[PDB]
Amino acid sequence: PHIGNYRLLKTIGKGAKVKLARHILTGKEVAVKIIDKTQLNSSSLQKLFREVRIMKVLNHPNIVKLFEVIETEKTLYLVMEYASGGEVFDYLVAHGRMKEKEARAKFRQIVSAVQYCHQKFIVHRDLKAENLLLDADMNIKIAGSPPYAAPELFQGKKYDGPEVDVWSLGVILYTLVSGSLPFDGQNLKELRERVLRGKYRIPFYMSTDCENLLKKFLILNPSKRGTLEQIMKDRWMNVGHEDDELKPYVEPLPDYKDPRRTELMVSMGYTREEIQDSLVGQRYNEVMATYLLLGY
Amino acid sequence: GNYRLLKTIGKGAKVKLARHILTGKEVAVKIIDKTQLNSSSLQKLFREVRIMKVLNHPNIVKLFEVIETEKTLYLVMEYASGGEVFDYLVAHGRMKEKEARAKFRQIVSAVQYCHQKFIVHRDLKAENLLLDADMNIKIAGSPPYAAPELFQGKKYDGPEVDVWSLGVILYTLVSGSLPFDGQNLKELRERVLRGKYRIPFYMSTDCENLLKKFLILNPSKRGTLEQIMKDRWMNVGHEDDELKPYVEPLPDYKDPRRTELMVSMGYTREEIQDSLVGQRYNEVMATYLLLGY
Numbered sequence: 001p002h003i004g005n006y007r008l009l010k011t012i013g014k015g016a017k018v019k020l021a022r023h024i025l026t027g028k029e030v031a032v033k034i035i036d037k038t039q040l041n042s043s044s045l046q047k048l049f050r051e052v053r054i055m056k057v058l059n060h061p062n063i064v065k066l067f068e069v070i071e072t073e074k075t076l077y078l079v080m081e082y083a084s085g086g087e088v089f090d091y092l093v094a095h096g097r098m099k100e101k102e103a104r105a106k107f108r109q110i111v112s113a114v115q116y117c118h119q120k121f122i123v124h125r126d127l128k129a130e131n132l133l134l135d136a137d138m139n140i141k142i143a144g145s146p147p148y149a150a151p152e153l154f155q156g157k158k159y160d161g162p163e164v165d166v167w168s169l170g171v172i173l174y175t176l177v178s179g180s181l182p183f184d185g186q187n188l189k190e191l192r193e194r195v196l197r198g199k200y201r202i203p204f205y206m207s208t209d210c211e212n213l214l215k216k217f218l219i220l221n222p223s224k225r226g227t228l229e230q231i232m233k234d235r236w237m238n239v240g241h242e243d244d245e246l247k248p249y250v251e252p253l254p255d256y257k258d259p260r261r262t263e264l265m266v267s268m269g270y271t272r273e274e275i276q277d278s279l280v281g282q283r284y285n286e287v288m289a290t291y292l293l294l295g296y
Numbered sequence: 297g298n299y300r301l302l303k304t305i306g307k308g309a310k311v312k313l314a315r316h317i318l319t320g321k322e323v324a325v326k327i328i329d330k331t332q333l334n335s336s337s338l339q340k341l342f343r344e345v346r347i348m349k350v351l352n353h354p355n356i357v358k359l360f361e362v363i364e365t366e367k368t369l370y371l372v373m374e375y376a377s378g379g380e381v382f383d384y385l386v387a388h389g390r391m392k393e394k395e396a397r398a399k400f401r402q403i404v405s406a407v408q409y410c411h412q413k414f415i416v417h418r419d420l421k422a423e424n425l426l427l428d429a430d431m432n433i434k435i436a437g438s439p440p441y442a443a444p445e446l447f448q449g450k451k452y453d454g455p456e457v458d459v460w461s462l463g464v465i466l467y468t469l470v471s472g473s474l475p476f477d478g479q480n481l482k483e484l485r486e487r488v489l490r491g492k493y494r495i496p497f498y499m500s501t502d503c504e505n506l507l508k509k510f511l512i513l514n515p516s517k518r519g520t521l522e523q524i525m526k527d528r529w530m531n532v533g534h535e536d537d538e539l540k541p542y543v544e545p546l547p548d549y550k551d552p553r554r555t556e557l558m559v560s561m562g563y564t565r566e567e568i569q570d571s572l573v574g575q576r577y578n579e580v581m582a583t584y585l586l587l588g589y
Contacts, residue, residue, distance in 0.1 A: 047479060126480045146439065149481050155449040156489065159482045186340055187419045188442050189452045196449065 003077055004070050004286050006032060020082060025268055026293045030067060031082035038074050048076070055080070056284060059251050060116045062109040062140045064133070068289035079289060083141040085134025088176075092129070097179035100207055101240065106132075107173055108237065108246055109140040114169065115228040116249045118162050125159075127168040129175055146191055147171060147181040151220050154192045163225040170217025177210060178203050182218070196220075209236035256280060261294040297363050298579055299325060299372070313375060316360075318561065319586045323360060324375035331367050341369065348373070349575060353409045353542055355402040355433040357426070361582035372582060376434040378427025381469075385422070390472035393500055394533065400466060401530060401539050402433035407462065408521035409542045411455045418452075420461040422468060439484060440464060440474040444513050447485045456518040463510025470503060471496050475511070489513075502529040549573060554587045 001008035007022040017034045040048065055066035055078065068079035085091075088106070092098070098106070110132065117124055124131075128148050133141045150167035152159050174182040182200035185191040198220045202211055213236040216226050231237070232246045256279035265275055270287055278287040299314040309328045316323055333341060348359040348371065361372035378384075381399070385391070391399070403425065410417055417424075421441055426434045443460035445452055467475040475493035478484040487493075491513045495504055506529040509519050524530065525539045549572035558568055563580055571580040 043483070044479065125482065145481055153481060153485060154447060156447050156485075159485075186337065188438050188446055189418065190336070192446060192449075192452075 003032070004068060004079070005290070006030070006079065008032070021079075023079075023289070023293050025290055026296075028293045028296055029082055030079055030293070033076075033078040033080065035076045035078070036074065037076055052076075052078070054122055056282060057120060058117065058122075060113050060249060062113040063116070063142045065292070066284065067292050068286065069284045081141065083133035083143070084136050085138060087130060088132040088134060088140070089129040091134065092175065092179050098176055100177055100210060100236075103173070103176040104236070104240065106138075106140050107176060108241075110142070110172065111169060111228055111232060111237070112246065112249050113140065113142050114165050115232065116251070118165070118228060119248060123160075123162055124165055124168075127165060127172065129172065132172070146188070147183055147195075149195065150222070151195055151198065152222055154196055157222070161222070162227070163222045166217055166225045166228065166231070167219075167222075169228075170214055173210075173217065174200065174214060177206065182214075207236070209239065213237065254279075256291075258291075258295075261291055264294060265290060297370070298361075298582070299323065301325070314372075316372075316582070316586050318583060319589075321586050321589060322375055322377075323372050323586070326371040326373070328369045328371070329367065330369055345369075345371070347415055349577060350413060351410065351415070352544060353406055355406040356409070356435045358585070359577060360585050361579065362577045363579075374434065376426035376428050376436070378429060378431060380423055381425035381427060381433070382422040384427065385468065385472050391469050393470055393503055393529075396466070396469040397529070397532065399431075399433055400469060401534075403435070403465065404462060404521055404525065404530070405539065405542050406433065406435050407458050408525065409544075411458070411521060412541060416453070416455050417458055420458060420465060422465065425465070439481065440476055440488075442488065443515070444488055444491065445515055447489060450515070454515070455520070456515045459510055459518045459521065459524070460512075462521075462524075463507055466503075466510060467493065467507060470499065475507075500529070502532065506530065547572075549584075551588075554584055557587060558583060 005024045007024060008019050009022060010020050012018050012020050012031070016036070019032045019034060021030055021032050022028070023030060035048065037045065037048070052069065059065070064083060065081040066078065067081065068077070070077040070079070114124060114127070124142075126145055126148070128145050131143050133143050135141055148168050148171050150159065150164050152164070171182060183191060183194040185194055198218065200214075200218070213231070213234050216231050216234060219225050229248055232248070238245050256276060262272060262275060265287075266272060268290070270290070274287050275291060277283070278285055279291060282288070298317055300317055301312045301314045303313045305311050305313050305324070309326060312325050312327060314323055314325050315321065328341065330338065330341070345362065352358070357374040357376060359371065359373050361370075363370045363372070407417060407420070417435075419438055419441075421438055424436050426436055428434050441461045441464050443452070443457050445457075464475055476484060476487040478487055491511065493511070506524070506527050509524050509527060512518050522541055525541070531538050549569060555565060555568060558580070559565065561583070563583070567580050568584060570576070571578050572584060575581070
């Protein structure tokens with residue numbers, strides 16, 4: 001069922017297909033987005049190319065790593081890290097609310113990841129529980145949307161900046177510890193009325209710290225919103241981590257010269273030469289893909 | 297109660313398809329556990345019930361019975377055995393304009409009727425539009441239908457809301473797609489707010505001209521459905537038969553055919569009248585109505 005070096009196995013998403021697959025050369029499992037470009041309107045094509053630019057650049061243990069991009073005139077393939085544990089939504093529906101200790105663990109990962117995005121002036125602009133995935137080890141991997149929307153969407157304000165993500169993150173925290181959305185309703189006009197006033201139900205079991213942290217995210221006025229760096233200093237964020245406070249993620253420097261992997265690739269028939277070129281050039285080709293994939 | 301429950305057919309509140317034991321008629325019963333409904337769900341359930349009781353149009357689903365217990369409310373209603381109009385679009389592709397028109401005159405009629413009684417549906421969708429055995433409309437997710445004023449934080453209360461929505465419904469009926477899309481709400485909003493939309497190459501100029509009467513950004517500059525009823529596209533194929541506001545037929549609570557049958561069933565002429573005039577939607581009312589087929 002071959003494209004590049006990948007044995008396709010089950011589909012796992014449709015609507016653009018997502019196939020789970022084996023990298024022939026390393027035997028590693030990965031997910032392959034298959035995208036029919038011939039079917040995409042102009043601004044979908046925009047958002048696709050953008051997504052791709054961003055994919056290429058983020059390197060955080062809780063954002064899904066991109067491995068390979070195979071472009072053809074009609075079809076684009078995005079080969080990427082596969083989160084076996086599925087959505088966080090699912091897990092909530094499944095086991096109900098998270099105890100605060102667990103929400104915190106997931107949530108540190110979440111805030112870290114989005115802060116990292118921000119360092120690179122990337123805003124996710126549309127976060128949801130449908131975007132938060134889980135690996136084998138219950139780690140977050142970042143990959144419908146009304147109840148996440150910031151107030152400014154319903155005031156026709158500009159909806160451009162980082163503070164959009166901050167509001168979002170408030171909703172996510174709230175869902176993570178309560179098992180439900182802080183602003184709901186059976187229709188858009190209710191939903192909006194509720195988002196705009198900004199009040200939300202405080203569940204009786206919720207710790208006061210938790211509620212204090214919510215108040216740092218869900219502030220109505222955009223320009224009065226914390227940065228994620230500031231929020232990163234919050235007490236609830238840090239309970240259980242008295243020594244390793246959440247600080248902005250620092251990504252580690254590239255290493256395109258790993259002898260372990262280079263040797264293995266040379267066997268495979270790759271040249272030290274191209275291996276270098278592809279890595280330095282950040283080509284995301286079969287050579288880059290392989291090197292990265294052997295990192296596992 | 298008086299009903300044999302058959303296939304379930306919705307959950308999330310359940311809907312069971314059932315047969316009225318005494319008439320053998322198929323009905324759908326919404327079963328609702330009130331004990332799990334929070335406050336404003338409860339307010340809405342009560343509102344939907346008020347409205348249900350009062351609308352009597354051949355393209356809104358009839359209420360037949362309301363059975364109240366402390367914990368559980370059941371709503372007995374007409375069952376649209378043709379499914380969602382959405383499903384049918386996804387199934388058959390777009391509608392030819394002639395068919396769109398046939399469905400759409402029923403829809404506009406339905407909603408216009410609603411307005412005559414000062415009800416605004418406030419939230420129309422294609423998930424709200426069903427079909428019966430004979431592919432007739434029976435009125436029963438939501439962001440692409442939302443009017444501009446939703447994103448302007450402007451007040452969102454009046455019938456002109458429905459008029460915008462109708463536009464969107466018209467458009468998806470004949471194009472098989474929504475006029476304002478996007479993969480996120482920031483997009484969708486920018487689009488709804490500009491107000492411009494793709495005109496498919498096959499669309500008639502008449503059709504497009506009707507769209508123009510619906511999808512008018514400024515709320516207070518929007519037609520009433522009575523005026524729109526007068527439009528050309530609406531009336532193509534109906535030159536004798538211009539659509540007009542539906543006139544409710546006059547209360548008929550004394551049909552002797554049904555009254556007799558109900559007397560033997562052990563019902564008194566008395567209660568039969570009370571239940572009907574009083575619009576009680578109790579078992580007696582249910583039965584009388586259901587005997588009407």
